[PDB]
Amino acid sequence: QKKKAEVTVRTSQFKVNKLLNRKQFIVEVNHPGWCGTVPAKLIRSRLASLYKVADENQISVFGFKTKFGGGKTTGFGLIYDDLAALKRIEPNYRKARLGMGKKKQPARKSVKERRNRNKKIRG
Amino acid sequence: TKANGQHAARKLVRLRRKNRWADKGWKKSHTFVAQKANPFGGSSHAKGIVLEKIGVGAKQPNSAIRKCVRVQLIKNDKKIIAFVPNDGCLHFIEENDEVLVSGFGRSGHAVGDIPGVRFKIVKVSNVGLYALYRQKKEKPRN
Amino acid sequence: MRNYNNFNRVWKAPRRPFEKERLDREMKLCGQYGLRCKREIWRVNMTLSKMRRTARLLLTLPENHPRRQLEGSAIMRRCHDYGFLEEEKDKLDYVLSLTVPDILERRLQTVVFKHGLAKSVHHARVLILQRHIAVAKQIVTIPSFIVRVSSEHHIAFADASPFG
Amino acid sequence: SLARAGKVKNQTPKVAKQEKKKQPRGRAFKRLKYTQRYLAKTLKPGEKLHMNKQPPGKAG
RNA sequence: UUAGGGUUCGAUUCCGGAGAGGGAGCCUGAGAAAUAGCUACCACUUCUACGGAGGGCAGCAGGCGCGCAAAUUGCCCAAUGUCAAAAAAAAAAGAUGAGGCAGCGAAAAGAAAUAGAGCCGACAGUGCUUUUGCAUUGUCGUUUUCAAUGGGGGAUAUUUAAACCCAUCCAAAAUCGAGUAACAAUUGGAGGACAAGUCUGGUGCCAGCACCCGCGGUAAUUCCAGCUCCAAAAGCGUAUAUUAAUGC
């Protein structure tokens, strides 16, 4: 109306981890005039253009911390090399935000109960 | 007086250990006869079953009648007296109702114009008796 | 179990609360500087007593003692910050001339008013808590925020403000 | 006399209080008093100013 | 808790020891006199078509009892560790009431809302004054008026293992909302000690108050009610113990 709100994404300290073939980058966000919190979709796009990644698949981010007063956010994210490396190395929950995770295991309690009854049987 | 010598220590120590037994503010702590004597066991409160309502007189300079309650203690099977500490709340105590009992003020001397009684009834049936007095709650007979 | 986080009191009530001398010097503050309740007046008192304890203990010592040297500079440094004392002070007797008002004076509530951004202390306490003040660029909505000598000259307003 | 209890509190009149507007609260309350007693006056209490005074009437 | 010297507490997160209903004996193992291992006795206790066979919560929840007194038969192995033949993943993610998370939680502890401002009228103080009048400061008030914001509602969303709490927001094209601000603060006090009544009604040595000193016998500053004011304040009384007060 009087403005156009934008989302600005930057980064501060960057790593190259060749052991896991990932990048570890402390994100910063600014987002002047943006309404509420920044959805992670946007951030992934900005990071793509920044590090010259052709994907928002390889970009997988977790956690965001909203500082008091005004639009501000900081966070941390991970880029991986290949898409196979991502799926393999990364925790389940992080993946499943992209929708690359695994189906949930059956309830812990029913497992216990059955795992006990298997000790009884001889075959 | 006292001894100022370098090796005088043991005489000093043994002197104190003797003279603290002339203090009643030492005995009241360390001795368990005091604990035993106290009807709560030295606990903050206790509960009891109301036996009988007992009208109790008053001492000579202030002539009055005081409303008191003969209660039995669940914990130790001792009997005790206590005072009803609100106006016109003798009603709200009835026989064989559970009741709580507290001390009041100085707990080594009996309160003025009620001899032998250091004990006031805070709660009747876990309801605040003050709450009944200055109306908020109503007594259960439920 | 297994909690390793500290708790501490920051405020305590002075002995004999029915002194009519003390009552005078309480109301005088709490009305004037717009303070919520007496709890605040006490909160500063504690922290001031604390500071004054170590300063007394340092002052006792002979010259060229490590306690005196190190920890003397620190006490002085942090009263230069917040503007409690100026940079002409060094003695650790100056530090013992600090009293309750000089603390309260540098709280955000009063600093806001005094810099010309409100019309009363009561009014400046609202301006804080309605999220329409800043202390350089950072929005602070606490009236008990103690303002640096440097940063009481950059107060401005919030960027969320319809008054800014 | 085991029962005659509550004698006085039966007989007494009950107004059952009277409506009043809400009071200032927080700083506003503390403000209210500090104006009354310590300002618009030649005196600070002290006992020199009396915070509560009452009208006459009856004397014994 | 104490200026100092001291005084008092330690069941309880860390370290060390000991115990697993009460006792004793034993096997295996590098390590045990193990108890969700074994054997026996004793006190209890559960099944059985009564021929026999079992049980040990001072492990987590939960139940009964007890006493003045104390939480959910919740969710998760994501984190932190441990055990293992074991990295993850490959069709293909070991177990864990250890531990984490949430529920309940005014023990304790930190921050902070319940209003803020301009016009008019009344009152008080100070200065000047032709005594008419003016200026400044503060308070109170009307169907007085003006803005702003949280509690709360919602989300383009975000937090989290998943979901909440916090935070950020009411469009970026597009998303809520105060005026008696009913979104209305209480608990103890006003004779003395001790901050606050020359009050008004009722009671009349009765009812009751009172830690203590003392109030009440029709003239109550203390009782029982109302108004008024005071202290602390989202906390405030009461009980008991303990420390200061104590050079008792």
Q: Which nucleotide is nearest to B63 (CA to C1')?
A: E205
Residue corresponding to tokens 């992670």: A40
Structure tokens belonging to residue C69: 């040297």
Overall number of domains in chain C: 1
Helix/strand number for chain D, H first, E second? 2, 0
Any CB–CB contact under 8 A between C133 and chain A?
no
Any CB–CB contact under 8 A between D8 and chain B?
yes
Method by which this entry was solved: cryo-EM
Q: Which residues of B72-102 are buried (b: 16+ CB within 10 A; e: fewer)?
A: ebeeeeeebbbbbbbebbbebbeeebebbbb
E runs forming strands in A1-123 = 9-14, 22-29, 60-65, 74-80
Strand E-contacting residues in D 3-32, CB cut-off 7 angstroms: 4-9, 11-18, 20-29, 31-32
CA dihedral (C98, C99, C100, C101) in degrees, to 10, reads -90
Structure tokens belonging to residue B28: 């009241």
Contacts of C155 (CB under 8 A, 6+ apart): C111, C112, C115, C117, C133, C134, C135, C136, C147
Give the full edge-to-edge strand order of the sheet including A22-29: A9-14, A22-29, A74-80, A60-65
Strands A60-65 and B127-128: unpaired
Residue nearest to nucleotide E90 (CA to C1'): A88
What is the 8-class DSSP label of residue A38?
P
* Helix %, strand %, coil % of chain D (to 5): 25, 0, 75
Q: Is any atom of nucleic acid chain E found less than 7 Å from the CB of residue B117?
A: no
CATH code assigned to A1-123: 3.30.70.3370
Residue nearest to nucleotide E200 (CA to C1'): D57
What is the resolution in angstroms?
4.0
Strand E-contacting residues in C 35-74, CB cut-off 7 angstroms: 36-40, 43
Query: By residue range, what is the domain housing residue D33?
Result: 1-60
Q: Which residues of C58-96 are buried (b: 16+ CB within 10 A; e: fewer)?
A: beeeeeeeeebeeebeeebeebeebbbbeeeeeebebbe
Contact: D38, C31; criterion CB under 8 Å: yes
In whole angstroms, how far apart are CA C38 and each of B44, B50, C19, C35?
32, 46, 14, 8
Calculate the angstrom distance between C1' of E116 and CA of A71: 27
Q: Which nucleotide is nearest to C122 (CA to C1')?
A: E116
What is the 8-class DSSP label of residue B105?
S
Q: Is any atom of nucleic acid chain E found less than 7 Å from the CB of residue A120?
A: no
Contact: D8, B87; criterion CB under 8 Å: yes
Distance, in Å, from the CA atom of B98 to the CA atom of B121, rounded to the nearest integer, reads: 11
Residue C69 in domain: yes
Most D CBs within 10 Å, among C18, C23, C27, to test the D interface: C27
Any CB–CB contact under 8 A between B25 and chain D?
no
Subunits close to C (at least 3 CB pairs below 8 A): A, D
Contacts of A17 (CB under 8 A, 6+ apart): A23, A24
Query: By residue range, what is the domain housing residue C147?
Result: 17-164
Residue C5 in domain: no
**Cα dihedral across residues C139, C143, C147, C151: positive or negative:** positive
Q: What angle do CA C63, C64, C65 make, to 5 degrees?
A: 95
Distance, in Å, from the CA atom of B111 to the CA atom of D38, rounded to the nearest integer, reads: 43
Distance, in Å, from the CA atom of A46 to the CA atom of A42, rounded to the nearest integer, reads: 6
Q: Which nucleotide is nearest to D16 (CA to C1')?
A: E226
Closest CA of chain B from D6, distance in Å: 4
